[model samples]
Target: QVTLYGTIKAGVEVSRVKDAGTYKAQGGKSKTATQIADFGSKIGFKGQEDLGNGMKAIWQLEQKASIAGTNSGWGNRQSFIGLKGGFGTVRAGNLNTVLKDSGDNVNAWESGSNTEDVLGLGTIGRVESREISVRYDSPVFAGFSGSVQYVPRDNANDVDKYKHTKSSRESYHAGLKYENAGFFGQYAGSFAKYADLNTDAERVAVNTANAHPVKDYQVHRVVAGYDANDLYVSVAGQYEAAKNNEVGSIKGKKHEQTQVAATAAYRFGNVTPRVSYAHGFKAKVNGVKDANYQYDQVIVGADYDFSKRTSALVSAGWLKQGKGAGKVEQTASMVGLRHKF
Candidate 1:
């Protein structure tokens, strides 16, 4: 059997980003911008062949696209092939890390999220990026399951264009999830050797310490939520640690941060109203707290379903950054439409 599935999402938005010094194109924050934006539109083809005796061969191909003319390239989304049996499913190809799938309830406006930190929790969570790796997903056993993925040393290294540096490293991601009744929970984590750095303060520290290539990076996150009775609520917490260089550095790892977020939504009469808030605590670098490294954000939105496969959406988001972290103040408001097939 084979099937085709896809979603088309587009919106109109008025937005502004306040810059205290750091923006990609170096534009004044006062500029109010308007445009037609694509909000994570995608399409996919999937099929399975039964081999009898409770075994099957399965495969899928998916891509991300933009009707607004800024589409990502072919095979840009998850694509894999594997066998499914009682043992579970094994797939290999470009895929999302387990951590990336655990932050579902962090925001109500799910469109145009990757473009800016103010639009979602991506900047703080840091798990939104995809990876090329092999993965195994265990079959559900009494409402519980787990996954493990690893990037081979041969393909793990990435080029740093900004620093003109080539990396050499390996990385892994794993997670466990459980769901029963109306409550759900998940724990996901990742570890990388020789992670790249972008923070100016941390870069200075690394340079002063006779900089070893960028050091290790680690993250751990947990989420718990309840989904039932036309109401959904979720809370999540995360911890991250990064090093300016290697262990040879004078102060060991350069940064350790903690973040927490919550989201809630209730549906009434085909309309679902939602709100989300997140806070990132000041990071401690070399055992000293960095007050200018904290941030917070809020997003509010509502979705009105006109049919099972179509909906209208409206959302607004606001963000504030720490003084040393670009000191950004950003806001956006949007009205959108979505359809699924």
Candidate 2:
């Protein structure tokens, strides 16, 4: 059997940013702008067929849509096919990594505008978004569960051309989670090898030597949260590291990055108020001691539920970049309505 499901989210946003002082690299002066925005509006089809005792075939195809205009294209969101049984569940196709899925659960304003403060902090080389891959999720045992995903190689690239010349690009993600009562926690990690990965160390080579060898990237994250008595709280931290590789006259150097975030919310009747804060640690190039970047952000928002599947929301966010001479600042506010079917 197959069933259709989807959500419609639209909003108007006003945003402004202050130019960084003495930072010409960060272009654009302070200005205010307004526009319509789509807050992750999407539609999907999902189904499951019981093949036998304790076994089933499952699949989902989800796509993003724009309520303000035409469709945003298909399968832009999570889309996958899989199997489930007593042993566990296995899935393949475009899917989100364990890190992204786990983090969103603890965020109260996850449905807010894309510029929400919780998402402002840099990714720190973490692969949390969707990608072509295969995944496995283990059954819950004593309130504990685990999942793993692997990407053999990016198919978009000319594999045959590079097969005999360069190292193969491969990536993997894994996570362990615990849930009981109103408390929850998760630990997730991912690694990318020779993936033409983007990192500070690699960029250094490109700028200084005009070329760079493939490097490795790795990231790990931890999240803990509690929800009860109309109150919610969550804390998360992440670390990213990259391997040093040389190209031409530039010598590769190891680099590391870190980030931390927290959120709290309280509900009263049909209204819930929430706040979040995040900080990105300074990242220094291995060879360039004077090069570094860091940032901080905050968000305040509230949600008013008109019905079980409809809500009105308003939020404001502020972000500031620090370190080096290219500091930048930005502020944004949005009001939106969401409906689910």
Candidate 3:
């Protein structure tokens, strides 16, 4: 059987940052702003065919989110083809690694306000990884399983595989996961060398007015979750360390950051209410430390099932950032429809 699925999402928001002012634009207020919101709008296809002896082949292709005036290229989100058997499953393509899935699994809610948004602390904390590579998923045993992935720096000109010298780059990622009828857990990590710039200087941006080379780094994360029909809960934590030219300086330095998030949701027929708490901070080993940011985000939403092939969902989420960070609170509300064919 073959299946096609997709989701469309749209929303509106009011921000207090006042137009970003361009690089040097003028005459903009610092109090209020408004715009359309875009996140979680995507489409994909999947298929499976039985071969024999309990073996099968599978394929999937998905794309990144699209905003009101943006276009994401094909397979920007995920595209893979592979085989599965009682032993395990293997696939290769431009797709998310185990770390990415683990992070998403730990996030209790869907859409813009979730703690795992790319621009949010989750990505900054390095909780997920996306790349071109091969992955393997072991068959489940007692509700526990594992996956691993390796993406080589196979680009030409030794650009993506170099270790340093303004043209080097290398990276790898791995993870493990477990799930029961009602409980789930995952752990993942990623490592990369920053000295080479990956493919070109265009691929990496260094601190301006700084000439020191960025060193290699790594990040790790863990997540746990539980669901009981009426209620669902999840917790996620991440840690990352990097060596780079400090802002406004020409010397090499090290920086570390950590993030934690907890989410809970309740289902009452067609309506589900979700609430979440998140915290982000920089490690304090050296004289450098983050100002410590706390987030309290709440979401109240509902879904109406039109049929097996279609449904509609409406949700609202709001977040408050701590004071003194120059960070503004954000709110998003959306009405979306999903279809499967």
Candidate 4:
């Protein structure tokens, strides 16, 4: 059987920031920022075929569906093919890293937040980013389940059949999670063996070691939350480090940073409001304090359900960027509609 599913969320907002030195803006930042924004929207089709003896073949093709302007590349989101049985499900293709799923509910807000950008959590975190990869998901046992994902250095550009030596642009992600009686907790990790100049940069140089620099980087993340009785709360923390002087966001011989966030919300009738706070402690460069790279942010928002698959999202947020980060103090507000089909 084939199934079609997706969520299209878009909203309007009037926003302004205090300062954004050297920050590149789309269409150039304006004093009174007014426009329609897309939080995350997608269209997907998935299908599965029963083979026999509890075995099945499954596949999915998904893509971003932009609302106002041009859309993203086709099948740029979680397109995969796989087989499954009692043992566990394994899939291959472009997929979300295991670490990304562990903090899926950390924010829960649809928009108007820069905390994740600073904290390196969720979509903003390198560990949480997607990749061309393979994954295995274990079945739940006593409300506990686990997942593993790996990304190969597929030579994303100009692949030659002969240069088969293992590539250094590989990474792996692992996650362990539990959910029972409205309580949820997860531990996730990601590690990269070499500097990944994968996105926004094309690779057309010599093969293997010559194509990229050698470095080691990893991130550890944990999240715990409870959701029941119309109330919701969650907390998350992450620490990341790199070796061999490169690939880390902050410039240093050795790079490391720790960040944390918490969120609380309640639902009344068809409206649910939430508040969240997040902080990214000063990063340590070469094991020394780098105070100019820290940040703090807060978000306030509410979702009003118009129906089961449709809703209105309203949010306001404030963020402070450190001196090293352009000293960009920003505030934003968004009001929009969302629908799923």
Candidate 5:
């Protein structure tokens, strides 16, 4: 029979931005000044059944998110099910993509407000997708294993030709990962092809008037980490590319982005100290893009354990979005309580 388990995390925070920073919090003056809330809260279930010849059916359904006072429909987090055999395991449903799985592998701190944060929520560090898809995890071979995923345009309305066959939004992702006992890491890449989202016409700027042909976006990422008794460290990076000469070209410019990050942690008795950093760079678009709008973030945190299944955390972060995009620069802090059962 399968079993059920879940975790709930709630907190308060203050951020320099109007969105109340990344995590959840209480009280507020300005939009950013309000205490942030819901750093992490999740619920899940899992079970497995034997299938005779060295095979088993496995499944998992999980949903985790912040329970802020309001609901905007973005909180639906994750759910999935799969089958396992000697060869590997296959799963489908709302799940994390290859990029998200590998990207978080090297981060010592996985939180909403951390500088190196990249899981759940907006463009800051979000990579979970909901769709009909399948995933395969290869059996461990020489201390290494990897996974691949494909999401199809299985929507009922999808058809050929006039159905916007060439203009529909579609995506696919694949990745390889390996962990050796205490030290390990992963690398993943993904691509998205979309139609009807842009206009076609080689103008000086991104033509908001013309419709664009099929456009593709690609990303390559790498993450590495080391774990020892009470010390840990991790590093991650990625390079993203987009077609530059699309119909609505920005001064005939190309789009590109690069991000690099690192994290460190030390566990002492019932407490752990964590620190992280991430740097981002984005190329100009339409000659008006802020060249200095690159971003740098740093986070310092500490968590104390109250018991085997409970803990408390306090953290703060500073972020600077350079090149006149200072509006994106901000400071954030959070305090939280967590429980697991």
Candidate 6:
């Protein structure tokens, strides 16, 4: 069996920022602007082939694209091939970490854009973005299930004869989830060890012993929610930390960060009103002893469902950086339409 699915979401947004700094060489002062935005449109193909009485082979190919522009890419979203049996399922390929998927059941906006309260701050807090890995999922038993993933550093293109040596970077993610009645909960964690901290080309170099300032990084996240009677509520918390450090490197220092968030929604008739709040704790970085910055954001939105596969949304959000270096503020309002096929 084969299936094709896709979604198109776009919106007009008006945004304003105060005291926002730029990274360019000639950057200073505050600026503001507004424009139309694309809200993460994507297309996907999936298929399943029955292998036996209790087993099957499955594969999926997904891509992300912009409805407003020609720039598009393949496999930006969850794409994988796997085998499922009466015991469980195993998949290998680009995949979203268990920690990232754990929050999907609670995020009212599905973590679409920055317009969502937690989308911007969650990534640094404890949200596992995405990576290439092999994953295993256990069969649900009495409303409980679990998953594990392993990611190797040599996932770029040389996997045919990759060797795991002392300098080989790697990461692991694990999660346990439960859902019963209208209650759902999850606990997920991830840990990574880097052979070379300077591999992230986008960031400044790490200066330390063997030029490896960041030895390891880890995160733990928990989420709980309930949905019943046209009402929904959720709460989540996470903690992230970097081990080892370089005295003067920005991304190489030992630091801890935390975040907490909650969301609530009530549906009546064709409209559903939702509200969310997220708070991020200050992260201490090397060299900047007095540098402390945190994030607080709130979002209020409503969705008017035209049908099961289409809807219109209107939302507003406010974000403030807590008093410290690089503190800034932002506000935005958006109206959008979304359809799935």
lDDT at position 267, candidate 5: 87
* Model 1 CA lDDT for position 224: 83
Per-residue lDDT of candidate 5, residues 188-286 (tens digit): 776665422231111111123553333455667777778777877877777655554445545244445566777787889889888877776654433
Over 1-341, each residue of candidate 3 has an lDDT whose tens digit, in order, gives: 87776665544443333223222234333444344555456777878889886888988887755556465676766788888899898878876767777766555344443322322334323445567777788888888788877665553124434454443344566777777777778777766665322211112333223333445555677778887777878787776655663344533566566667766767766556666566555452122664433344555555555765555656555555444434335555555554444
CA shift of 100, model 1, Å:
1.1
- Model 1 over residues 1-341: C-alpha lDDT tens digits? 89988888888776888775745555537577777888888888888998885878887777887777677676677777777788887777777677776656444465675334655555555654466777778898998888787766555644432353455445677878887887888887777765544553222112234443455666777888888888888888877676655445443556677777787888887898887787878877665687566778887888888887998888777877676456777788778898887
Pairs of residues at least 3 apart in sequence or in different chains that clash in candidate 4: none
TM of each candidate vs. truth? 0.85, 0.86, 0.75, 0.84, 0.78, 0.84
- Evaluated against the true structure, the overall lDDT of model 5 is 0.59
* Top-lDDT candidate index: 1
For TM-score, candidate 1 versus 4, the one ahead is: 1
Looking at model 6, how many pairs of residues clash? 0
Error of 6 at 157 (Å): 8.7
| Model 2 C-alpha lDDT per residue in residues 1-341, reported as the tens digit of each score | 89888888877777777656633343655556677787767899888999896888888888887675657767777888899998898988778777767767445453334454423333322346676679898999997899898866543234544454555546778889887787778888777765444433222212234334445666677878877778887787877666545453333566566767777878888888887787767764453433244667787877888887898888777877665366666777777788888
Q: State the TM-score for model 2.
A: 0.86
Candidate 6 to truth, TM:
0.84
Cα lDDT of candidate 4 equals 0.67
* Superior candidate under TM-score, 2 versus 5: 2
Positional deviation of residue 282's Cα in model 3 after best superposition, in angstroms: 3.3
lDDT of 4 by residue, 171-279 (tens): 7788888888988787787777654322211112234343323356677778888888898888878776655333355433555667677878889889998777877
Give Cα distance to truth, residue 131, candidate 4, Å: 0.7
Provide the clash count, candidate 4: 0
TM-score of 1: 0.85
Greater-lDDT candidate between 1 and 6: 1
